[PDB]
Design a protein around this ligand. Structure first.
Ligand SMILES: Nc1ncnc2c1ncn2[C@@H]1O[C@H](COP(=O)(O)OP(=O)(O)OP(=O)(O)O)[C@@H](O)[C@H]1O
Ligand SMILES: Nc1ncnc2c1ncn2[C@@H]1O[C@H](COP(=O)(O)OP(=O)(O)O)[C@@H](O)[C@H]1O
Ligand SMILES: Nc1ncnc2c1ncn2[C@@H]1O[C@H](COP(=O)(O)OP(=O)(O)O)[C@@H](O)[C@H]1O
Ligand SMILES: [Mg+2]
Ligand SMILES: [Mg+2]
Lengths: 51, 506, 456, 177, 51, 456, 68, 147
């Protein structure tokens, strides 16, 4: 089982990086109580360099 | 495959609005006590929130500052840090979901088996059911030991103290009493106070090897944990045990060291600078143990119908307690032992001299007592324990004559060997609990004279072989006795015929 | 007026009042919006008073308003308290509704003055033979009760409660100082089943209550007893354990910060015992007699608590586990039990000689029994064998059927008078009944009943 | 003991006196000046010498303050010096204002905004804060660039936080639990 | 031994879920740190004034 | 920022820092000019921290500037520490120059979690008859050598080190806490001359050093053992006296502003002991086997310090002054010593029956000893006369000459395998050697030797 | 240090002076011991008269107060 | 006491040569200490006696019963001990005095046990006789030392 877990773990390791940006804009939207999309564009394409 | 995508959505259904919070600033930090400046609305016993998800409890509400104790680690807190009122008293999770789990004094899982699914929480500090809501103790709690169940019987809702020196079987007697409940219907709680983490794990490994863990809640507050957690653990475990009692069911609780809870409460008190008394304990150390032990009780059908709002009817609930205390060199006159001996319904005294003389269970039956007595026994054991009492009493009186037994008078020589054979019958092994039928065979055989031709050295192999014989050729009679522990002329004749047949061939 | 809580440290609470409205020592205070009572212990000065909560302090906070009541803790008194269970404050802990009180009295007062004392020593006729002969009680006296559990302590209290009410027109009060909640429920049902509950008032301070409650319960029960005495009655005050009254005082003294005395007791040990014990006396109107259970720490009779209590005891009743096995249910030990009233200058030469004669015979028999056991019955003289026969008859004639024990004995109860008691034992010592079998002298009441149980 | 415990008698004495003689504003200035003089390094060193009597130390302090102390204030200074409490003057000065504020029905709030400041904004909240507290509010706005967006309102032990840092803290503990 | 395989898998995935949350918090922080303006700050201050 | 010394009293020093730069609890501080380190123990308030000096204060003055290091004491860890002698601060106290460390750890740490504990019963042979019989040690278990002054704690530990550490394939840490400087020198030259110094890390804090040094020496040695355990290795940890850690806390507790508890001990006795003892354990990565010597003040096993220590250990070996006073060594008490490995399901029924058999014979003889003093031997029954002989022989057969004790005994040292230990005692209990004089079993290693000594 | 018996909110020395040496005011009461402020001419071992006919004995004559 | 008593020690040749700046070479130096402690009625449980017995390299216990019994040196051989042992003795005394203290400690015990017993074996009678002689030999007068 410890050998099996490592095979699936390397798939989620990169799959999570493809959706953290959505979690960040919805989080910012709930904290502000208003739309945030106008300022999300350059952050979504650059933050992935340290994840 | 993945899980993270379906959990974030829930976090986006939580309030972000401002909430008024009464706040203070940490002024000093030392030995686990944080003195705060502010908090004008904090209540005595309310929990304080510090930076970092650390929580405390307010215990010294003085005029100019709050003395609070940390329910965790205090070496990360500092002067100038902000402190916030929570508006809540201390509460722990409760319900059947705790059975087979190991938790800390706050109800957090430490076994690593996953999050607990408890459907309710309850207050750690509560008052005990009043006088008029109780019912007399008249139902048994079998421990599986012939010496305890025959001479020092424990009933449902009773408080029986296990008292004696270090390393003489105090823990073994209480753990075996929990193991014997796996088929009885009584839920069990074991509270570990000030023990090392590897010792608590050997008891859980032994509860799991004997099949008793699935019926037990294990509450732990180990020796490296905060004195506040060690002080609160017995109340947290009691609160988890009170769930079953208030809902019409029965529970058993073991406090492995009330003397370590007293030592932890003394530390907090002397550090808050409260006036000291005898052995440096605070003035309310009697009230500490009394407030805990008076919750162990039996409640009437009217209390259970009132609490359940009618849901449960016709059933009386209970909480039985087995507190443990260590004495120093047999000194029962020490302050904490004196308090608890006066609070409890009875005491089981274990002795170092008996334990070193091969009497493994070590129960001194000459001073041990149960004030509930025969009301906590089934009909069969109540009938066969009367003569066992007389034979041991006679043995305590005529035991020096053992070396001058030849010169003894025949009547006395007859009494002396009976006393020595009944004394050898009380010896038992660890993790070997006996059932009502199996205890009855041994007590019946000695009380009706079936050991007068057995050498005092063969009494044990005789007992072990006799039980094994009845388990094979008399399985229906053992099953009959185990229903309620009933006795009549047919059971008496049935046991007699089996013992006579055993002697004729085995 | 009203003050404000300024400090909370366990059961000790400091309250600040206006300079013109400071409450008196022992005055009762009420916290607004919470069912909590505070008794004032000390006046610290600058408007601030130190008090002890008569309940739990969980959930309290600084700044709550507190109201002065103008007097000490005041409890209901009189006829309405009979057959009821109450707490230290006089509240009905039983679910039987409010007490039909007509008057309330404060729990703190001075002992009756030098001029209020009765003109001599008057025995209280308990109606129990062994007690009225060997342990004579004086009216207004204090009796220490010694022994373990399962030896008849409760049945002896219920018989005394019945006899003072039916044979002397009196009443009883029971003070449960540090009462166990299980035993408090069992005792209440036993008294209801035994039909004695309507003759006694029950005041309980349970073990799980704060130190202040356990210390004041004895004064609450004593205040109810004082009312009946003023009515013109002779009253019985039962104190469940006098050692727990001493310990509650030690606990309160430590909480208030006072410097401890010898063996760790409170510095006020003798004064706290004297304040309670000096109210129990025979006045010129009535007489409160008290039966108090006594516990001895580490079996040491020189320890400050036993030492102080024994200074106020007029009689000592010892209950024996051995005697119970013999079958004498009263179980009072005629050799270990004693009374200060066992003096010819108080009870007259006749009562004294009869009691000392019984004790002399019972002593010799205990020595002879070791001889009979070690050497045999034939080794004794004719006079010694005759003495053994009278001693056995005396020992069984010390037994008696109580009205509350009919369920156990299967026979009706008996109330023997002091006159009948002295006359019965005087005859057996002289040999007037040497022809009767010893069994004829078992569970019969007066001496004429032994003679009749014999003809059969 | 806490300097506050030791200063409570002296401060309540100053206040009951100022109130019954209508001097609640004169004593504020006198106590602020006395507190100030005592803190100076030269005066601090002078007050800590074994050569001077209590009256000599008391006199030296009234002389430096002079007119700032009315007859009563100078006598109060003599009481504080006689009892050897000249090190508590800053604390005595502070607690006097607190008793006075509860009397005048007022509060000194300490608002801290992230990046914006406007005369309209201060009053917009002083109405609600006053309504909530049932007192007049003497706002003391300031700048806290640490905050991403929002304001933190402190009044007494109450702390009404509406700062995004506060919403960050909440979101963070929620996500890691 | 059978139960230990499932608790290991759910423990590791939970530990990952908390790390993903910490990255999402940082993202939301960077986004708000580049999106708050006077028109939003007034809404935050006026909204608080009603609470 | 920078702080100034404001108050020096003995070993305790107060340092005042800017109210925005107050150092953390347990943080290390350095005095300017003087070479002294202070550890913050308490934050009094107003920028002041209370600290304990890790050196002497004779050169310290009020107003000296103190520097905050931002962390707790950081000592060197790993392979570079082997074959070196170090102080509490980790400085080398040998003339071999500096240590080539590649990492430093902080002495303060959390105990391993409940899920990290590991259970094992591998039996570890010691070569001593009394221990191998009644106190079987286990690999990865905790052993305690309890005893007063002058009964053999150091000697016995040295014999174990020799019979285990020398053969042990893994590394080892030896911590001398409050030890005599002469014992440390003899042991260093002994490890160096035996060529075993290469696999042993030595940390020394003797009795001539300041309280703070003796209070943290145990955390330094344990921090080095924890680095090796966490690498997956099997380690041996020997502590000369862990009582000196408790005593250093008692010496400094009152100056830290803490009220005293029972027997004049710090109120934090059980927590300070639990915080150290819970780190000395065998987790799921590697196994620490540890032997601690525990001093017993005035030979009283009920003293709070010894009494709080028993619950932290797996094997408890008790040394008796009454046995040592008869010329018997090792002076282990078989009726007071205990071990968790003593279980038929862990070792075997033959071993267990022999151990319980020896204990039974010695327990019965403890009561006949007084009987023989009054009266005489003749008045005993034959079974008692026969038992007294075997008990006196078993007591003597428990004595074994040790190689480390040859300087004192004068005779050569002996090593007995558990097989010989079981065989000999079983034979004596059977009565096979009842033909040998009592003097033949004294210091005779195996039973065979006893048969030979009887001929001399 | 610690607050003493004279340090009270009502001991306002507005008129720094001394008058009435044969009379005083009770500051506090505890377990049969009373602190009195103002009895300037009381002698050691003197009888002190309180209201309702009660008497005290002077035992501690301090700078700031009398203990009885 | 620990700060005082740890100074009494033996220092190596390397320590002396460094301190004496080369003036003294090839020489070890030493300070031997003989501290005295008084007990009340033999009570060793007192705080100060407990501390000092736990610091020294040995102790010599003098007993009052022995002093009154005629053994004037009064050294209790069972309770007294040296943590240096045979290393502190010359070759002749080291060989001749082999196990004498442990043999005296056992003789004191054998005497009390055989006080009221019937005739014992040759081994017992021989040990009891040999013990009474070393006990009388250890007695010596004040101001009369032996080479
Ligand atoms: N039948 C028995 N009943 C009880 N203990 C037994 C029995 N047979 C053997 N023993 C052994 O006696 C010892 C009792 O240890 P236990 O932990 O129960 O004692 P304790 O008094 O609770 O010790 P401690 O005070 O340290 O907690 C164990 O080694 C146990 O295995
Ligand atoms: N006078 C009596 N007559 C008959 N039986 C009695 C009598 N007194 C005591 N007993 C028996 O002894 C038992 C214990 O007496 P009790 O008064 O309840 O003592 P305790 O309260 O200490 O338990 C009773 O339940 C009853 O069986
Ligand atoms: N096994 C032994 N054989 C001989 N002498 C011993 C033995 N054990 C202890 N001793 C004596 O005691 C001292 C060494 O014991 P030690 O370990 O220092 O005792 P403790 O550490 O308990 O104070 C020496 O003086 C020595 O003569
Ligand atoms: Mg245990
Ligand atoms: Mg040593």
């Amino acid at each position: 089982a410890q050998a099996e877990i490592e095979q699936e773990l390397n798939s989620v390791k990169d799959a999570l990086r493809a959706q953290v940006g959505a979690l960040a804009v919805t989080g910012a939207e709930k904290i502000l109580g208003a739309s945030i999309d106008a300022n999300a564009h350059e952050q979504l394409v650059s933050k992935l360099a340290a994840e | 495959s993945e899980i993270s995508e379906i959990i974030k959505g829930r976090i986006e259904k939580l309030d972000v609005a401002s909430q008024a919070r009464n706040e203070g600033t940490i002024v000093s930090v030392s030995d686990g006590i944080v003195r705060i400046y502010g908090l004008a609305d904090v209540m005595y016993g309310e929990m304080i929130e510090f930076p970092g998800g650390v929580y405390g409890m307010a215990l010294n509400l003085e005029q100019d500052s709050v003395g609070a104790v940390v329910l965790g680690e205090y070496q990360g807190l500092a002067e100038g840090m902000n402190a916030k009122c929570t508006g809540r008293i201390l509460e722990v999770p409760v319900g059947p979901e705790l059975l087979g789990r190991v938790v800390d004094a706050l109800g957090n899982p430490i076994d690593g088996k996953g999050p607990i699914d408890a459907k309710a929480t309850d207050a750690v500090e509560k008052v005990a059911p009043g006088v008029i809501w109780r019912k007399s103790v008249d139902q048994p709690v079998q421990t599986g030991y012939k010496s305890v169940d025959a001479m020092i019987p424990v009933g449902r809702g009773q408080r029986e103290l296990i008292i004696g020196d270090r390393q003489i079987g105090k823990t073994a007697l209480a753990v075996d009493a929990i193991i014997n409940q796996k088929d009885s219907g009584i839920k069990c709680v074991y509270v570990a106070i000030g023990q090392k983490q590897s010792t608590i794990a050997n008891v859980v490994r032994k509860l799991e090897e004997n099949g008793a863990l699935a019926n037990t809640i294990v509450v732990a507050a180990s020796a490296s944990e905060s004195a506040a957690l060690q002080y609160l653990a017995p109340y947290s475990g009691c609160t988890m045990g009170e769930y079953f009692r208030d809902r019409g069911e029965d529970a058993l609780i073991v406090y492995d060291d009330l003397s370590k809870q007293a030592v932890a409460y003394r530390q907090i008190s002397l550090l808050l600078r409260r006036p000291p008394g005898r052995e440096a304990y605070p003035g309310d150390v009697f009230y500490l143990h009394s407030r805990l032990l008076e919750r162990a009780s039996r409640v009437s059908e009217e209390y259970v119908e009132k609490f359940t709002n009618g849901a449960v009817t016709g059933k009386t609930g209970s909480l039985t307690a087995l507190p443990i205390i260590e004495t120093q060199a047999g000194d029962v006159s020490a302050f904490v032992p004196t308090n608890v001996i006066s609070i409890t319904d009875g005491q089981i005294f274990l002795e170092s001299a008996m334990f070193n003389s091969g009497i493994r269970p070590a129960v001194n039956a000459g001073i041990s007592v149960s004030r509930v007595g025969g009301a906590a026994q089934t009909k069969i054991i109540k009938k066969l324990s009367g003569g066992i009492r007389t034979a041991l009493a006679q043995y305590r009186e005529l035991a020096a004559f053992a070396q001058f037994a030849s010169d003894l008078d025949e009547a006395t020589r007859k009494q002396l060997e009976h006393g020595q054979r009944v004394t050898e019958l009380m010896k038992q092994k660890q993790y070997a609990p006996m059932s009502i039928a199996e205890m009855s065979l041994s007590l019946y055989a000695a009380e009706r004279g079936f050991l007068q031709d057995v050498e005092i050295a063969k009494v044990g192999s005789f007992e072990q072989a006799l039980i094994s014989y009845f388990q094979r050729e008399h399985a229906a009679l053992l099953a009959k006795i185990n229903e309620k522990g009933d006795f009549n002329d047919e059971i008496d004749a049935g046991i007699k015929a089996g013992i006579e047949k055993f002697k004729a061939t085995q | 007026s009203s003050g404000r809580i300024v400090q909370i440290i366990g059961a000790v609470i400091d309250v600040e009042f206006p300079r013109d409205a400071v409450p008196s020592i022992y005055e009762a205070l009420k916290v607004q919006g919470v069912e909590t009572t505070l008794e004032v212990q000390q006046q610290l000065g600058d408007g601030v008073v130190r008090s002890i909560a008569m309940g739990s302090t969980e959930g309290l906070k600084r700044g709550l308003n507190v109201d002065s009541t103008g007097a000490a803790i005041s409890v209901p008194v009189g006829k309405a308290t009979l057959g009821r269970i109450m707490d230290v404050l006089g509240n009905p802990i039983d679910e039987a509704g409010p007490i039909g009180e007509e008057e309330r009295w404060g729990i703190h007062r001075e002992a009756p003055s030098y001029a209020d004392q009765a003109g001599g020593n008057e025995l209280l006729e308990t109606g129990i033979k062994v007690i009225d002969l060997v342990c004579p009680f004086a009216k207004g006296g204090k009796v220490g009760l010694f022994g373990g559990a399962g030896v008849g302590k409760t049945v002896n209290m219920m018989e005394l409660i019945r006899n003072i009410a039916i044979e002397h027109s009196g009443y009883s009060v029971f003070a449960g100082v540090g009462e166990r909640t299980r035993e408090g429920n069992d005792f209440y049902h036993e008294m209801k089943d035994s039909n004695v509950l309507d003759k006694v008032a029950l005041v309980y301070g349970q073990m799980n209550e704060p130190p202040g409650n356990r210390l004041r319960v004895a004064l609450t029960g004593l205040t109810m007893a004082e009312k009946f005495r003023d009515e013109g009655r002779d009253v019985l005050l039962f104190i469940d354990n006098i050692y727990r009254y001493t310990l509650a005082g030690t606990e309160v003294s430590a909480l208030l910060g006072r410097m401890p005395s010898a063996v760790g007791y409170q510095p006020t040990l003798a004064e706290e015992m004297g304040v309670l014990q000096e109210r129990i006396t025979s006045t010129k109107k009535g007489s409160i007699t008290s039966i108090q259970a006594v516990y001895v720490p580490a079996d040491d009779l020189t320890d400050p608590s036993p030492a102080t209590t024994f200074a106020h005891l007029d009689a000592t009743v010892v209950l024996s586990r051995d005697i119970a096995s013999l079958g004498i249910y009263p179980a009072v030990d005629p050799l270990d039990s004693t009374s200060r009233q066992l003096d010819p200058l108080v009870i007259g030469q006749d009562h004294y000689d009869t009691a000392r004669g019984v004790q002399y015979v019972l002593q010799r028999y205990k020595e002879l029994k070791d001889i009979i056991a070690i050497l045999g019955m034939d080794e004794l003289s004719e006079a010694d064998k005759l003495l053994v026969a009278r001693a056995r008859k005396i020992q069984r004639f010390l037994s008696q059927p109580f009205f509350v024990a009919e369920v156990f004995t299967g026979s009706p109860g008996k109330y023997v008078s002091l006159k009948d008691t002295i006359a019965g034992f005087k005859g057996i010592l002289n040999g007037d009944y040497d022809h009767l079998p010893e069994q004829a002298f078992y569970m019969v009441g007066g001496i004429e009943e032994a003679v009749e149980k014999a003809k059969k | 003991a806490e300097l506050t415990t030791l200063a409570r008698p002296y401060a309540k004495a100053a206040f009951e006196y100022a109130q019954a003689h209508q001097q609640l504003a004169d004593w504020s200035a006198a106590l602020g000046v006395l507190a100030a003089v005592s803190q100076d390094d030269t005066v601090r060193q002078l007050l800590k010498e074994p050569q001077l009597t209590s009256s000599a130390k008391a006199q030296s302090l009234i002389d430096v303050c002079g007119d700032k102390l009315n007859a009563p204030a100078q006598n109060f200074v003599r009481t504080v010096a006689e009892n050897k409490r000249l090190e508590l003057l800053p604390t005595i000065a502070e607690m006097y204002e607190q008793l006075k504020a509860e009397q005048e029905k007022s509060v000194e709030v300490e608002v801290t905004s992230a990046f914006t400041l406007s005369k309209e904004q201060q009053d917009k909240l002083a109405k609600a804060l006053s309504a909530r507290l049932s007192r007049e509010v003497r706002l003391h706005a300031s700048e806290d660039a640490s905050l991403i967006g929002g304001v933190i309102i402190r009044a007494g032990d109450l702390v009404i936080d509406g700062s995004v840092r506060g919403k960050l803290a909440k979101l963070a503990e929620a996500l890691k639990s």
